[model samples]
Target chain A: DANLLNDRVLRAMLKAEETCAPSVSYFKCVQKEVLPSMRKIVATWMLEVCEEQKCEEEVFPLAMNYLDRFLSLEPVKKSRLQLLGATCMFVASKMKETIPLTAEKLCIYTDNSIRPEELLQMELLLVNKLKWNLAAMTPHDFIEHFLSKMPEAEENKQIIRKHAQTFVALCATDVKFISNPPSMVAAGSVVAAVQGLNLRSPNNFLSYYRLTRFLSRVIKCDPDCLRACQEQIEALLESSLRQA
Target chain B: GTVYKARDPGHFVALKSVRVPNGEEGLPISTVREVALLRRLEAFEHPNVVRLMDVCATSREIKVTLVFEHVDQDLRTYLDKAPPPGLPAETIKDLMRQFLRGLDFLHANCIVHRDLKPENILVTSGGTVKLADFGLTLWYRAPEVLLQSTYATPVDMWSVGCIFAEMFRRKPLFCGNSEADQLGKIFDLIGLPPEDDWPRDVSLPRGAFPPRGPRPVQSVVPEMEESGAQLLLEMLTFNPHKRISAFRALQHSYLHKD
Candidate 1:
């Protein structure tokens, strides 16, 4: 029913959407798609770190985007993904950027034992990759929209979601390409990831199509690609991860 | 106030100042749990988390002052004056990743930051990320036990989602006038739970569940951005556990700008 009270989460998410910031797209991605994928990625990143210099997954994820944006805007080499990643932290001087990692220190933490010059070079590369899509939406913002807008249920929605916890952890590991726009990927992954955890809070699962329509307008995606990507993540759970 | 920069001074330092608020005085307390989790954090230091510096109970104001580094401002100010609508793919990726590190650390020690938001985070002078505002920081000394005696970690996760939304939207995701309104706002996009979805949706936390019939989701919100709105929908999922966590937050592809 049109009056089926959009999922309280979707409602809150929508409400939160009103406050979407200067960088609306990135926040939405974080709140919707990225957060769901956190555990998987963290573990992967952690394992990767261990495979090399015994580094921690602590700041690598955050730095990756920093490198992405810096290089997107500034222009750097694709070969130095690590250096670009490090450059992210380098450019995040608390005084200037959002998170305060200095360019000099970011190089020190990496396993490659990056030099200061290489770190700077990496920063330049990252600036170029992103073409300077510096301001982005994240899952934090999107989740707030869904959750805060949700209608008051007699039962604790939080508790309901508590029953559906697996979705969140599963999302992190999914190898969602970084180049894709955040919103569509976020919604598709969110729906698919949570279901895999057997946390069927899909009360509004069907409504995701409606959600898709909304995204199609904002981010400007080819419906064909959107559908393809949507199906891809949704099928990830039952699919074989070993193939790739 | 005395500010002594640390050797790394990466982005922050705990400082002892005569004019800081201690919550009781409407200001934040120096890490009560940081002191507890100090050892755990000392074992590993990352660029995202705000590192602890020397702590001292100053002879002045009967306050405990800790020294840490500094960032330009909270996400609030940055977003308010945000230059444009879209950020580079790499920047979003970095911030989301850093936040995960901080959350992973807290979760690892069974510690929960019951409150997580951009306001609690700092963007360093070097453009790095650091989480601050430890007011609602939870130290879970015990597992499988409810910490109602103190704070809630899930709320911390909830706030992280909200803050992440703010990072992109450049606006407060849910600025509800009332608690019920806040819930209603969430329900609007994610859709309402069907009677079957909430088979036991008949009672209230305090009293009987009002037989006020099923809730209704509004037709639509005014500001609609497909990608932006959908992202918000994912974050605001009503299910508490369903509401993305730190570990899973990094992949949204939005960060990758896919």
Candidate 2:
């Protein structure tokens, strides 16, 4: 009789998937006056560490998952923001990588500014703060789940995947998308990737409608929210393009 | 902050509290895996796997509590206090079969108990055995882990082999001081492998020179029955590919023999 909810865990995963994104309160942060510039600096530095370590695709998203979740929970000092970033990177590396970046190595990446002991203790502190709920489901994780529903031809698959990853990587570093659920961001990335590939006939209203419907159904999201996220994503790409 | 033995009305539960300071980053790496993995295990618990009864969290102190079915002792402590002659043969067989059943369930779900040692195996007053502690680190780590190679369920089968050996012998089969020495201890028991014949994707750490000592299977346990020794041999096979799986080992003649 109790066994029925066992498979319910699988269905529960659909909801669990959305809960992976940290709930951020911008109004409260404004009330607290926690430095938003500090977050931007720390987020960029965290991405630099991922590049330095040649970390896997999931590592940066996971690190930011820790970052945003922690920020949402605690009022961290601007001085310790780098320490928070370093610890997040440390935890993410351990979770997603086979050979994790050591505390010693991470310190060197930080120009020996923070001691390994500090980083380690902070790791425990962060773990406690998050209430032992690690494993943030990132858009990177959902990309493949979203991509599978696409009616991609064999040849176009590689380009779509490559572009999808690039879009998600961009999403991971941006503060604007922090509030969006990972599934919506994943759907947005896939749609933007397919659009970038110019797969749809420009004026094919029915085909584009079907594609958006497919994405919305797969992600189980509102079509309005999906388009809003997708629009922000394309907007980011255009600015990045103009700069390049 | 620490594990506590707590009273719940007429019964008692082991309250395992994992704490993180409210100001830090996120959960510890091990607790994250432990909780998520245990959540999945809730659907798969047997008499042999440790029972995770309830999970609750508190925001003020940022502590996560795991309430488990309290067991009086673990296998290590039980073995330490047992009388010289060792447990009865029937008792040993029952415990081993339960252990196998637990491993069978874990592997069937694609979960690998990375650290399967005597300390991690818990025992109760009623003679029930359960597997606990899923930390992804040292001692009982498979050869692929030490060698930094990709591995799968076979890695866990190797740990099960080590734990099984310890069950009959009352001591670790290979007591190495360090990770390097651990592999050396393994190579010494079974003849060191030539580089050409090494398990695919696994390689020895550079400058590793194992002391060549051959202690044949029969000699290691003069008292082990023939069928049991045969099963142990397959479990302890040098090649991961050749290692007996938990599923197949459950079906081995030793456990089922009259």
Candidate 3:
């Protein structure tokens, strides 16, 4: 179905993102055993599982949102980190997918380290801890809003969207991007995608300075702040690529 | 599922409990998503929508209880209490405006209430209207949802149209025994959709029901003003794409009239 874009939705999302972000310093403040590295490892594994399962593009980031939000409020043993990740995905898949992942399949993905019963128990704990606020905004939600405002060719738009989505997913797996509002990440990803693809040649709007300033304005953040975030994203991709 | 009017520390609250399914399946996805969505929408704190005060559960228990601020009455009961012919015109206008304001907030946030019926529209004793029960009933189901075709926010507008008519008529606009019967009843009032406007992707063929012509909105709710009648027709437009949105509907002359 061809659905028309509504600007009111974009405006509402911009406002709503402020309240839904997870704590950026959860590792320092909330957890004794859950370290940044542990989170990174579990997040990467969760991303891999999401890819393998062919879950919706929004699922991984949304799952990570749940994971981070839960971690911010409660502490868990390092041993249960993967279980937390699995439960996050289980809940997120149900929210975004028509045919959600079953508890049995999610346990298998965890290599049965956690049983379906454990996952079920954890699901209750997770939702209650989150106060049943599972529909947190993700960078992916903002990406579509940002893309609609850009001046680009239709084919180039698709490429930018694909590259930006990859950047969003990549950001979700890292700890540094934790407190950044989804709108800021979305703006940075769109700017970084345009730069990486060298789409700045002809269009002045796509130029690094102009695009960053425009997006920063749209998201109501300082241009310098957006620039640093975009640079961080570029650096993350560089390291990720080098490791690959 | 059961709802109870219970007392809290200082005020009254509505307690709705959903039984946890008995299995290794954990909580049902519907319950999880519904509570999640409700919490998300709760952040907006829009006056027209009902407030979800809290959620309670325990590992020992097999049910989840959702707590909401208990309003005294729903529109169904409010209508039953109306005197003589029906509600005053100004009261109907005020109620519709508040209802649309809530709906506009939801649509702006990209949420469709899916169900909009008199029973689900709560009216406080002070005359404020609040949209409750983010779920559904077939009587207010939109044509797109009825067709089992891909649907979106416009589905809520169709429901709003039915509710708007009910405000004046003091009864549901479309009442039917089955899905096919529902469509037939809708078509009898709004007339069959144009051949091209019918959704092509649905398994239900367009020609399955006999053709019918449109009836005047005045015939359905003669108490409605001209502007209100026009707005109602736009909302009930058969093609979802052509249906007037909550944003635009709020700006209609009927609402803007002094």
Q: By TM-score, who's the top model here?
A: 3
What iRMS does model 2 reach? 6.3
Q: Report the Cα lDDT for residue B55, model 2.
A: 68
Candidate 3 chain B has its poorest 10 consecutive residues by lDDT at B6-15
> Model 3, stretches more than 4 Å misplaced?
A1-6, A97-112, A197-210, B7-11, B22-25, B59-62, B83-85, B108-115, B136-155, B169-194, B197-222
Can you write out model 3's per-residue Cα lDDT over B1-258, one digit (the tens) per residue? 778897554245787776666565677777777777778776677878877899876653368888887777888989999987898888888887888899987777667777678877888777888887674158998998888996888998998899888878888899987778889999999998878999978957889889899999899888888889999999999999999988788788888765
Q: What is the lDDT of residue B15 in candidate 2?
A: 77
Q: Is candidate 2 or candidate 3 better by TM-score?
A: 3
Q: Go through the candidates in order and give each one's DockQ.
A: 0.01, 0.11, 0.61
Using all chains and alpha carbons, the TM-scores for the candidates as numbered come to 0.39, 0.55, 0.85
Residue B121 lDDT, candidate 1, scale 0-100: 74
Root-mean-square deviation of Cα positions for candidate 2 versus the true structure, in angstroms: 9.5
DockQ of 1: 0.01
- Residue-level lDDT for A161 in candidate 2: 76
Evaluated on chain B only, what are the TM-scores of all the candidate structures, in order? 0.65, 0.82, 0.86
lDDT of 1 by residue, A183-225 (tens): 4444444444334345555554335556556545434566576
- Report lDDT per candidate: 0.45, 0.70, 0.83
What tens-digit string does per-residue lDDT give for candidate 3 at A125-205?
Answer: 988888888888888888887776666778878888899999988898787668788888888898888875553564534
